[PDB]
Design a protein around this ligand. Structure first.
Ligand SMILES: CC(C)n1ncc2c(C(=O)Nc3ccc4nn(C)cc4c3)cc(C3CC3)nc21
Ligand SMILES: CC(C)n1ncc2c(C(=O)Nc3ccc4nn(C)cc4c3)cc(C3CC3)nc21
Ligand SMILES: C[S@@+](CC[C@H](N)C(=O)[O-])C[C@H]1O[C@@H](n2cnc3c(N)ncnc32)[C@H](O)[C@@H]1O
Ligand SMILES: C[S@@+](CC[C@H](N)C(=O)[O-])C[C@H]1O[C@@H](n2cnc3c(N)ncnc32)[C@H](O)[C@@H]1O
Ligand SMILES: [Cl-]
Ligand SMILES: [Cl-]
Ligand SMILES: [Cl-]
Ligand SMILES: [Cl-]
Ligand SMILES: [Cl-]
Ligand SMILES: [Cl-]
Ligand SMILES: [Cl-]
Ligand SMILES: [Cl-]
Lengths: 382, 382
């Protein structure tokens, strides 16, 4: 049919080595915020065979047991034995952490009123919302996330005990163009790759991934005789987690956001306190986009903001409504300016960004779940 | 004026700690390809005070002196003394490199005809082109890159000897909407932050950044009395490079591509051989997008592709022309299918991706310069 197109998004499981790093970075952030709500945290994680390395800058009054925080995060993910390729009990935890650069500290937050704190860096950030789901997220990324959540569920409840924590999923949806909005028609292609034990055969895994994972997640109305299934397409995935592939914090920024929809400014979320606008301004921009769609001002919208290090107010704000509003982009920009204050020192109050809830964000995407403050739309006056 | 909007892009200098990691990762890739054109390389770099760590997976017949390759890359960037916060002569180089997972190797390339090699991973990748510049790149990212190149030029020629290698730039352009294409009107805001010595005062630096950097890069026709300048907005940037901020490979993926324009699938380029579609398919998608614009089929275009690990052919191809073609998106998709083969085993031939030219790509963006093979448009038959 004319007016239709394919769009592909991916997601990864909690044991994906990049996602291990995100969760550890946010476990460290949460440990600091639990004792010091004003902790300055820039914690990068690196994961390879037998190694978690923490690298970065933390200035905090907190007393944090990095060995305990890191190992407890790896335990939760499910890497608890050499047979699985990684073990929280016996892995190396290396720490290369120093205080925040005093040059950054003096430029950003020292002797500044909290509301008037400088952005922790320059950068650009986008928020996106789409009416194609209730949670205002693209169906492609929602389904990809849910397939990884289903794998973790069936691993943890023991129904597929051959599963290991490292997984990736990919969903291609055929969409109908609808006056600048998008309507999902069908699932065109699904990929699932998941780490597994040496006992289970490829046919058992492929049958289980179709019958127990895909059918348990993707509504039958989206699946048909033409839907393509790439299930364990590598043929073998015994070696996995950090052993199979080095992981780093902030290497899943598209999985973390909109699955390639909307736009991205390049900033990583995990391991960063609210003064890092890479996180706080991206959460705020999601909040603005979702408020515009839930407020009925547009079906689809993209918000861009940008900052300079040491400057409170955004340098630029931009609204792109994909032709899905009766109001002009200028009118929507004026509504945003009347209703939102995107200084990081105000966002922290509105979104409660000193609360140690960050490890919860670091798998299955930061947006479209659990009614986090940035997912509760603001009632707009105009 | 109605029909106008702001768009912001950033770039970073060669000494930005994330960009140090990209250049080292690609220095390592090039060293392998110089001896073994079929080297399988997945080299992550981590940079913090006094440390370069290599982490990842390399299977290669090459004999590579990692100490020499890493230190020569850091020397070229200009970190050659403790006074600058980092020194190629005396820094720690740690190596955590293993062979490629045999499970990946058997699934992707072992006993496979080169043309029919599997994608090295699943994933999605985008190519973008815009007629707003001759090189088919957004003006925002082009200017941001050139400001960092100008800083490196004036550091290396000794005209601003107080400059250090770590820099960031950000350019906001006011655009006119033109039937789905974009026309730059003016530069709204410029940010420049650059690491400097203890001798030079803030006023000298700000004067020099305006008169010797901005006026040397940005045409006067884009600058006016209302243009906003944030020059050394932190007030002090003596501590810099890895000492100021931990760096990782693949944490500048938006700087590497379109500066937030177009779209991104999440994949990092640097440290990866052609079998990693994160790089090869993104280069190929840029090549397709630039061929469509230079072929006169559209003013602006976005290409999405996606892959499954172990599968040669893309799972999905999608064309979005922003309403800037007389041809439908379906017709452009058919032209792409007739003219391009986006198997990684064919892209490697068309774009010469075994050639050790990758360190050249790892600063100032991978697209819109130096007539790399993916920047030479293909003559289209239709
Ligand atoms: C920048 C990326 C993420 N990005 N942002 C939007 C799109 C669309 C898109 O929205 N297409 C539509 C949707 C609705 C429509 N109504 N009408 C009348 C025409 C329409 C066209 C498509 C792609 C494919 C992957 C290239 N990417 C997009
Ligand atoms: C997904 C991001 C990177 N993305 N992709 C396109 C845009 C545009 C955009 O192209 N707007 C235009 C351009 C030309 C036009 N002609 N007509 C008649 C209407 C038009 C609207 C704007 C923004 C701002 C930052 C929110 N982001 C965009
Ligand atoms: C394919 S690996 C990336 C390439 C790898 N660094 C290399 O050396 O070729 C990327 C991700 O795919 C998954 N993966 C690892 N081994 C795999 C296998 N044998 N089959 C399928 N997916 C695998 C893991 O989630 C891993 O983080
Ligand atoms: C601001 S730092 C990121 C935050 C940092 N990790 C922290 O602990 O707060 C990000 C980048 O900004 C630049 N930067 C470092 N120190 C700076 C300073 N004093 N002023 C301005 N920019 C600086 C460097 O390019 C660095 O990689
Ligand atoms: Cl940065
Ligand atoms: Cl979920
Ligand atoms: Cl990877
Ligand atoms: Cl409306
Ligand atoms: Cl990956
Ligand atoms: Cl340049
Ligand atoms: Cl950063
Ligand atoms: Cl045309």
């Amino acid at each position: 049919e004319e007016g239709t197109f394919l769009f592909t998004s991916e997601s990864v499981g909690e044991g994906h080595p990049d996602k291990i790093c995100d969760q550890i970075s946010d476990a460290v952030l949460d440990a600091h915020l639990q004792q010091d709500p004003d902790a300055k945290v820039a914690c990068e994680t690196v994961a390879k065979t037998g190694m978690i390395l923490l690298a970065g800058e933390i200035t905090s009054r907190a007393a944090v047991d990095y060995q305990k925080v890191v190992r407890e995060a790896v335990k939760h993910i499910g890497y608890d034995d050499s047979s699985k390729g990684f073990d929280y009990k016996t892995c190396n935890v290396l720490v290369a952490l120093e205080q925040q650069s005093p040059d950054i500290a003096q430029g950003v937050h020292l002797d500044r009123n909290e509301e008037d704190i400088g952005a922790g860096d320059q950068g650009l950030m986008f928020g996106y919302a789409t009416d194609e789901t209730e949670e205002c997220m693209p169906l492609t990324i929602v389904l990809a996330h849910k397939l990884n959540a289903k794998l973790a569920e069936l691993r943890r409840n023991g129904t597929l005990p051959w599963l290991r924590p490292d997984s990736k999923t990919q969903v291609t949806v055929q969409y109908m163009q609808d006056r600048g909005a998008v309507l999902p028609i069908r699932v065109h292609t699904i990929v699932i790759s998941v780490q597994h034990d040496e006992e289970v055969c490829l046919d058992e895994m492929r049958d289980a991934l179709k019958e127990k994972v895909i059918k348990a997640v993707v509504p039958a109305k989206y699946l048909d005789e033409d839907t393509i299934y790439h299930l364990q397409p590598s043929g073998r995935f015994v070696i996995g987690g950090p052993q199979g592939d080095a992981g780093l914090t902030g290497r899943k920024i598209i999985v973390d956001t909109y699955g390639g929809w909307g736009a991205h400014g390049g900033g990583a979320f995990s391991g960063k306190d609210y003064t890092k606008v890479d996180r706080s301004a991206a959460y705020a921009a999601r909040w603005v986009a979702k408020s515009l769609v839930k407020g009925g001002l547009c079906r689809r919208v993209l918000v861009q903001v940008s900052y300079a290090i040491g400057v409170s107010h955004p340098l630029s704000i931009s609204i792109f409504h994909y032709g899905t509003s009766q109001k002009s982009e200028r009118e929507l920009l004026e509504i945003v300016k009347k209703n939102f204050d995107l200084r990081p020192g105000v966002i922290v109050r509105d979104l409660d960004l000193k609360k140690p809830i960050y490890q919860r964000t670091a798998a299955y995407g930061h947006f479209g779940r659990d009614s986090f403050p940035w997912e509760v739309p603001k009632k707009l006056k105009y």
